[PDB]
């Protein structure tokens, strides 16, 4: 029993974190085989931090203008290239701790673990989600850029995020590991700002199923709803539309609990319209939307506490 914001064990990623320096700029890099991946703005100086032309800045650099430190070992850079907003530094040593890995570009609504790092050294691990507006509600300070987000499946690390920027609302923007930003953001100091965000409906439903698995039914009701009528309420509360594919994805949790998806939708409708009346669900007074259906299955018992 219990239900926690649960991150993946971070060891396989810790062994990949390094420090990249160019000029007086240092940030984190990810060392896999003989390549170190890091945000390309490591090549910016104090005077470049507005609207840099990265191709023009990078052609002025040589391999030896980059320093890569792995622990107390300096790795020599023997090639470099820019791919989108990521710099790839070829180094003379293959990381002996390279895990089995993939790069994935995730969809909004999906969750991942972040290994927050400073000076190439891991500091902490937490769970977040790719928001519908393609920001993340991270926890990042100066020096964190290059920290990565990941999921793990049967000892394969799927990297999905590299940290680049903090937006004016205090949320975060970054890239996939091929250097493409999530959302409409850029690695430049310009007017960018999160678009209006929405609540991830399929995830709230998954978390309600988690609450039932763990023995709590107080929020259920005798009603059902059509998908169309539910979505008319969702829209009013700034929730994402629920699709039939979401309904299908929730199939297993519905089967394990004996509660039809559209019946859980009617419970959620009532919660939106009435509030919680001072009660909590899985220790929260808000409707939590950063657990996916997979996250619930991963953490919860396959046996419902009936």
Ligand X SMILES: *[C@@](O)(c1nc2ccccc2s1)[C@H](C[C@@H]1CCCNC1=O)NC(=O)[C@@H]1Cc2ccc(F)cc2CN1C(=O)[C@@H](NC(=O)C(F)(F)F)C(C)(C)C
Catalytically active residues, by annotation: 41, 145
For residue 202, the partner it binds in ligand X, a second copy, none, with Cβ less than 5 to 8 A by kind, is: none
Neighbours of 40 (CB within 10 A): 23
Question: Looking at beta carbons only, is 39 or 132 nearer to ligand X?
Answer: 39
Using the rule CB under 8 A, is 5 a contact of a second copy?
yes
Strand partners, 37: 30, 88
Strands 66-70 and 86-91: unpaired
For residue 49, the partner it binds in a second copy, ligand X, none, with Cβ less than 5 to 8 A by kind, is: ligand X
Sign of CA dihedral 17, 129, 275, 207: negative
Using the rule CB under 8 A, is 299 a contact of a second copy?
yes
* Residue whose C-alpha is closest to residue 151's, from 305, 267, 298, 32: 298
Q: Are 91 and 34 in contact (CB under 8 A)?
A: yes
Pick the stretch among 37-45, 59-67, 195-203, 281-289 that binds ligand X (CB under 6 A).
37-45
Chain centroid to CA 78: 31
Q: Are 120 and 29 in contact (CB under 8 A)?
A: yes
Q: How far is the CB of 42 from ligand X (least distance, A)?
A: 6
Task: Out of 65, 123, 192, 304, point to the residue binding ligand X (CB under 6 A).
Answer: 192
Q: Are 172 and 136 in contact (CB under 8 A)?
A: yes
Binders of a second copy among residues 6 to 25 (CB under 8 A) are 6-12, 14-15
Question: Residues 6 or more apart from 226 whose CB is under 8 A from it?
Answer: 262
Binders of a second copy among residues 218 to 237 (CB under 8 A) are none
Q: Is 293 helix (H, G, I), strand (E, B) or coil?
A: helix
Using the rule CB under 6 A, is 87 a contact of ligand X?
no
Binders of ligand X among residues 89 to 148 (CB under 6 A) are 140-145
For residue 5, the partner it binds in a second copy, ligand X, none, with Cβ less than 5 to 8 A by kind, is: a second copy
Q: Which residues bind a second copy (CB under 8 A)?
A: 1-12, 14-15, 115-116, 122-128, 137-142, 166, 170-172, 214-215, 280, 283-286, 298-299, 301
């Amino acid at each position: 029993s219990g239900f926690r914001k649960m991150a993946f064990p971070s060891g396989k990623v810790e062994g990949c974190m390094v420090q990249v320096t160019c000029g007086t700029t240092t940030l984190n890099g990810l060392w896999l085989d003989d390549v170190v991946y890091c945000p390309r703005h490591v090549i910016c100086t104090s005077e470049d931090m507005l609207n840099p032309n990265y191709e023009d800045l990078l052609i002025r650099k040589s391999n030896h203008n980059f320093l890569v430190q792995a622990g107390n070992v300096q790795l020599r850079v023997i090639g470099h290239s820019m791919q989108n907003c990521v710099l790839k530094l070829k180094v003379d040593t293959a990381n002996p701790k390279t895990p089995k890995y993939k790069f994935v570009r995730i969809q909004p609504g999906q969750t991942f673990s972040v290994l927050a790092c400073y000076n190439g050294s891991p500091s902490g691990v937490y769970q977040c989600a790719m928001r519908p507006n393609f920001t993340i509600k991270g926890s990042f300070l100066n020096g964190s850029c290059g920290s990565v987000g990941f999921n793990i499946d049967y000892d394969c690390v799927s990297f999905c995020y590299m940290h680049h920027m903090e937006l004016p609302t205090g949320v975060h923007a970054g890239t996939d590991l091929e250097g493409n930003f999530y959302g409409p953001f850029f690695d430049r100091q310009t007017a960018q700002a999160a678009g209006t965000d929405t609540t991830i409906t399929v995830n709230v439903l998954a978390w309600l199923y988690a609450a039932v698995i763990n023995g709590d039914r107080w929020f259920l009701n005798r009603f059902t709803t059509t998908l169309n009528d539910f979505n008319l309420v969702a829209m009013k509360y700034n929730y994402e539309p629920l699709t039939q594919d979401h309904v299908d994805i929730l199939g297993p949790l519905s089967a394990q609990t004996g509660i039809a998806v559209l019946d859980m939708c009617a419970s959620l409708k009532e919660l939106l319209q009435n509030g919680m009346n001072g009660r909590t669900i899985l220790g929260s007074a808000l409707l939590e939307d950063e657990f996916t259906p997979f996250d619930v299955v991963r953490q919860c018992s396959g046996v419902t506490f009936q």
